Amino acid sequence: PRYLGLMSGTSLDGMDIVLIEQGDRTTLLASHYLPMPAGLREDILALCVPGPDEIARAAEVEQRWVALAAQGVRELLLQQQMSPDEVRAIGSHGQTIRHEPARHFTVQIGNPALLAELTGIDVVADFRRRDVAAGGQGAPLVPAFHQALFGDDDTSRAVLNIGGFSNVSLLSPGKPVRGFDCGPGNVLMDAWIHHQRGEHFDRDGAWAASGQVNHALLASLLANLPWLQEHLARHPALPAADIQATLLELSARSISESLLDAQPDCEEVLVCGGGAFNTALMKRLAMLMPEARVASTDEYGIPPAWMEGMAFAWLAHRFLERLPGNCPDVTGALGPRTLGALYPA
Amino acid sequence: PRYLGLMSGTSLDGMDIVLIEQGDRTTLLASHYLPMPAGLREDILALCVPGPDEIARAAEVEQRWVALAAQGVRELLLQQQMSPDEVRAIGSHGQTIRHEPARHFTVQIGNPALLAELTGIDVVADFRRRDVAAGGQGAPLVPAFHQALFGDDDTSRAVLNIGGFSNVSLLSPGKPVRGFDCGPGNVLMDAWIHHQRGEHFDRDGAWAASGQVNHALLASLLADFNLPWLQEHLARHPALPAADIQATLLELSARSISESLLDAQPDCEEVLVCGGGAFNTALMKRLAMLMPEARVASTDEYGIPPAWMEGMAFAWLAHRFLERLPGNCPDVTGALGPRTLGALYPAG
Numbered sequence: 001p002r003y004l005g006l007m008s009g010t011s012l013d014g015m016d017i018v019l020i021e022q023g024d025r026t027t028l029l030a031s032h033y034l035p036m037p038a039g040l041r042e043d044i045l046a047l048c049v050p051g052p053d054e055i056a057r058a059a060e061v062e063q064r065w066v067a068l069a070a071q072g073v074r075e076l077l078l079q080q081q082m083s084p085d086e087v088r089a090i091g092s093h094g095q096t097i098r099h100e101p102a103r104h105f106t107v108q109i110g111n112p113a114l115l116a117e118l119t120g121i122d123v124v125a126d127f128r129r130r131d132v133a134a135g136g137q138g139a140p141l142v143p144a145f146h147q148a149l150f151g152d153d154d155t156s157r158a159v160l161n162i163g164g165f166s167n168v169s170l171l172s173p174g175k176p177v178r179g180f181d182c183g184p185g186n187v188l189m190d191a192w193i194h195h196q197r198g199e200h201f202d203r204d205g206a207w208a209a210s211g212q213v214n215h216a217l218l219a220s221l222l223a224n225l226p227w228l229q230e231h232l233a234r235h236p237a238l239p240a241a242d243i244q245a246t247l248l249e250l251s252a253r254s255i256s257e258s259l260l261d262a263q264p265d266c267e268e269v270l271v272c273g274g275g276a277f278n279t280a281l282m283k284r285l286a287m288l289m290p291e292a293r294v295a296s297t298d299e300y301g302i303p304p305a306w307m308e309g310m311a312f313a314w315l316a317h318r319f320l321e322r323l324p325g326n327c328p329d330v331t332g333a334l335g336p337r338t339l340g341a342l343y344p345a
Numbered sequence: 346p347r348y349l350g351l352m353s354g355t356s357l358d359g360m361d362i363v364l365i366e367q368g369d370r371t372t373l374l375a376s377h378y379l380p381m382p383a384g385l386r387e388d389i390l391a392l393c394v395p396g397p398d399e400i401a402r403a404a405e406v407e408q409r410w411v412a413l414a415a416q417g418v419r420e421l422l423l424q425q426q427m428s429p430d431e432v433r434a435i436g437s438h439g440q441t442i443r444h445e446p447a448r449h450f451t452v453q454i455g456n457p458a459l460l461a462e463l464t465g466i467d468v469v470a471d472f473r474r475r476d477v478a479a480g481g482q483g484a485p486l487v488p489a490f491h492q493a494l495f496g497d498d499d500t501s502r503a504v505l506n507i508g509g510f511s512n513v514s515l516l517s518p519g520k521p522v523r524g525f526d527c528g529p530g531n532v533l534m535d536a537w538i539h540h541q542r543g544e545h546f547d548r549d550g551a552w553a554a555s556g557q558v559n560h561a562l563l564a565s566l567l568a569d570f571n572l573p574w575l576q577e578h579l580a581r582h583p584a585l586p587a588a589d590i591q592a593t594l595l596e597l598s599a600r601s602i603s604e605s606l607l608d609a610q611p612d613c614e615e616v617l618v619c620g621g622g623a624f625n626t627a628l629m630k631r632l633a634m635l636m637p638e639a640r641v642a643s644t645d646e647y648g649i650p651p652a653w654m655e656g657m658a659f660a661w662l663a664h665r666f667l668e669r670l671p672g673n674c675p676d677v678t679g680a681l682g683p684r685t686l687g688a689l690y691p692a693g
């Protein structure tokens with residue numbers, strides 16, 4: 001069946017809306033991004049810390065959030081010339097305004113009843129609360145999706161997300177799913193090329209690849225921008241591209257070492273997040289993990305930029321299939337649980 | 346199938362827990378009442394008006410609320426020798442802490458995911474939000490249940506709920522379901538007998554029945570609800586026996602109810618009374634005298650115990666959800682049309 005997934009993370013720049021086809025495999029049919037208006041962003045941020053009149057404020061803020069979400073859903077469907085009747089459900093994360101599992105609560109707003117009213121599509125939402133009710137942290141959610149996609153190959157695999165920072169899901173046969181942070185991802189390379197060339201990032205890692213790794217600098221680094229700038233002053237003036245090359249090597253070494261310490265027999269590293277598009281970084285990771293095949297998740301039909309939205313569409317599917325949606329090995333929950341709640345159209 | 350219903354009103358005394366069998370008819374199998382501790386009542390009340398730190402406070406309060414609800418479900422099932430697997434779903438009203446349909450929102454707490462986790466039973470909850478989303482007031486919800494129970498091809502009926510206050514569902518054949526608020530129910534009689542005798546309420550209305558209606562006082566009251574409000578009225582009248590005041594308060598409710606009811610439905614053939622007021626023998630007697638063309642009787646005579654009507658409505662709403670049948674009455678709520686109400690939190 002077909003599902004929409006709706007995600008809006010804590011950066012509040014906009015909403016990711018994806019449309020998947022789900023059967024034996026998960027396939028991305030379409031995707032859409034909708035920027036969040038400045039006014040909505042502030043009112044949400046103002047709810048992310050304790051303040052007065054929160055019940056009423058959150059109730060009114062979520063109405064605006066839902067209207068925007070419904071607009072985005074309508075827009076994606078229009079683009080695909082698809083009737084909402086062709087979609088089984090929307091999996092909506094909502095918007096986190098408070099997440100405090102130590103006090104046994106997590107709060108995502110996003111009035112799913114209104115989302116169903118406006119879209120005419122069944123909504124599955126409120127995915128974190130059941131994991132928390134069962135003693136979990138209510139996060140992370142995506143490793144369950146990683147496991148369903150890539151687990152059970154009888155193969156030791158790592159699903160590596162390279163965003164600003166790096167994190168990995170380890171899928172080892174006969175072992176619990178594991179998850180941990182690997183180190184910096186794109187954060188410094190982005191910071192360095194922005195500072196030096198006004199680029200948001202290093203496309204294909206081409207700037208890094210044109211430079212030459214400085215081993216003195218690399219050694220200092222291994223033993224943010226001001227943090228980096230502090231290091232560069234302690235060396236003669238280095239070409240900016242050599243700096244970039246050294247920053248790439250820094251990420252490649254930190255990721256590969258963290259991964260291999262936890263899963264030395266890793267056979268495949270599947271890379272998602274924007275770092276999967278960094279050709280130079282991907283090449284170096286492969287060199288540093290010579291017993292593992294390193295490839296983008298794209299090679300498996302999962303576009304690396306859309307992992308999160310697709311996970312939420314998938315969670316809608318899991319709910320309706322009466323299958324568990326959490327990964328208690330990573331959330332700390334007592335066991336597998338059905339995640340979410342159904343608000344029918 | 347079998348369903349649990351969980352009701353907790355704005356009076357904040359306790360939770361109604363009911364077990365029904367639902368097929369062509371709705372039948373009460375078992376019921377349970379669980380008092381709410383003062384500390385929880387106080388903390389809930391404090392969330393009913395705007396205040397500080399509400400998100401975190403509500404989250405902590407609802408966890409205690411859910412723990413109590415789950416124990417109540419457990420006890421009912423223990424008494425009935427029933428496993429949670431024998432229950433199809435719980436329909437939970439939750440606890441209302443803010444209701445402002447004019448601002449298009451209504452808020453019931455009661456973490457349904459936690460309720461499903463603790464009970465091991467599928468939970469259907471959050472019934473008001475879809476009605477509000479469709480432009481309605483999100484209330485009242487019970488008239489749709491009243492309709493399913495008592496709506497008939499040939500009888501003008503009024504289903505009258507007498508709690509602290511009174512509200513009625515008008516069921517006219519070939520006509521839309523109607524609903525409205527009929528005035529005070531037990532609120533003043535309860536306050537007056539508590540003040541004068543330290544009783545929680547006037548059992549069978551016997552104290553009121555021992556008194557005599559004062560027509561001057563009745564006329565003043567009707568020319569207009571709490572104890573200071575009454576004391577202010579008593580100040581404008583000579584000193585009356587306490588029982589006469591109680592008798593006059595009963596007559597106030599009886600006349601206000603009958604007059605609103607008869608004005609809206611002059612051809613009323615049956616008044617079916619539920620809520621605790623149905624147990625007030627003296628009040629029931631006066632309602633019957635004031636509506637002589639209608640048969641005035643407890644819902645018990647129609648197979649629905651009057652104390653458990655509201656809880657049973659929420660059990661019924663869980664059934665309506667699972668059957669994808671509408672749960673609201675848009676003519677009474679003002680919603681755009683019929684809607685499936687609620688959200689499913691599966692036990693899994």
Ligand SMILES: Nc1ncnc2c1ncn2[C@@H]1O[C@H](COP(=O)(O)OP(=O)(O)CP(=O)(O)O)[C@@H](O)[C@H]1O
Nearest residue numbers: 356508509531546547548549550620621622624625
């Ligand atoms: N045996 C009896 N004799 C007389 N009155 C009785 C009674 N049993 C119950 N009552 C009355 O019923 C009242 C409770 O009414 P009910 O239970 O229907 O209200 P409720 O629990 O729904 C709260 P609300 O007032 O918000 O509706 C008591 O306060 C009392 O006045």
